[PDB]
């Protein structure tokens, strides 16, 4: 039906058919996406948590097209209702980061887009504190995805705030610079470029644990970022 309250019940009823009824659930997800674009006041005031939790379980569906679609819907709820994810930051981050290791390109691509909007929708100081333990303990490619997100989020905190968070940010960044994967090391270099861009030379004491060749490589990308 078209009645907002009746429609949500039907959407929650249809999308509860996990692993079955693929086309009926795709229609419900496309319908759910339209409600997100409408800025519907009545739908989101009462059913955000219910929709989010059902949408997050959908990311674990056996169907790759169902997963990739829920990641596009999640991207819409993230940038249309960003203030509602306050109490679900860790859950939304860690579920979106797990989608980054799906075997299907269409699923990871849609998750990389959701993780891009997630950097500006989750509170920036709150987003850093979720990403730090993930960065320091996760395996490839989730640690790579979390570092890329932290780079986007570090650009949004003031210089006074970023210095206070450096004792917690720098451990994962120095650790990822020693990572076996070159893509992780570059994301750390580019993250340190963002940290240097904010606090300038004040970052220098934090890099004491860097080798000379990594310090030289890092200074190279700071200069390259400033030259253009």
């Amino acid at each position: 039906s078209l009645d907002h309250s009746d429609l949500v019940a039907e959407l929650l009823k249809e999308l509860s058919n996990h692993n079955e009824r693929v086309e009926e659930r795709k229609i419900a997800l496309y319908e759910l996406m339209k409600l997100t674009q409408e800025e519907s006041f009545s739908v989101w005031d009462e059913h955000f948590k219910t929709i989010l939790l059902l949408l997050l379980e959908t990311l674990g569906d056996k169907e790759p097209t169902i997963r990739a679609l829920a990641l596009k819907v999640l991207r819409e709820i993230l940038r249309h209702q960003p203030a509602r994810f306050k109490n679900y930051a860790e859950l939304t981050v860690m579920k979106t980061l797990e989608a980054h290791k799906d075997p299907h390109k269409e699923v990871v691509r849609s998750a990389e887009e959701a993780a891009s909007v997630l950097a500006t929708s989750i509170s920036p100081e709150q987003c850093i504190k979720v990403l730090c333990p993930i960065i320091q303990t996760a395996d490839y490619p989730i640690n790579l995805a979390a570092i890329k997100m932290q780079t986007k989020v570090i650009e949004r905190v003031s210089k006074e705030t970023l210095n206070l968070l450096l004792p917690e940010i720098m451990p994962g960044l120095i650790q990822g610079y020693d990572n076996s994967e070159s893509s992780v090391r570059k994301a750390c270099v580019f993250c340190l470029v963002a940290v240097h861009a904010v606090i300038g030379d004040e970052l220098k004491p934090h890099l004491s644990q860097l080798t000379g060749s990594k310090m030289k490589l890092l200074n190279l990308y700071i200069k390259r970022a400033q030259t253009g």
């Binding site: 070159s182 893509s183 090391r185 570059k186 270099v189 060749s213 990594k214 030289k216 490589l217």
Partner: protein, 52 residues
């Protein structure tokens, strides 16, 4: 020659459309290749600093 002209124009018009399909395919691979370039440039810069 007039009949020959009409047939040749069709082959030229058909090849133009076919050429567009190849240009769009090659330009997409460039977009995909561009992702690799920034990463492989980093790996090469690492080797040069390690040599020094």
């Amino acid at each position: 020659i007039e009949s020959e002209l009409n047939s040749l124009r069709a082959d030229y018009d058909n090849l133009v459309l076919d050429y567009e399909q190849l240009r769009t395919e090659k330009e997409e691979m460039e977009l995909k290749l561009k992702e690799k370039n920034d990463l492989d440039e980093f790996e090469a810069l690492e080797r040069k600093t390690k040599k020094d």
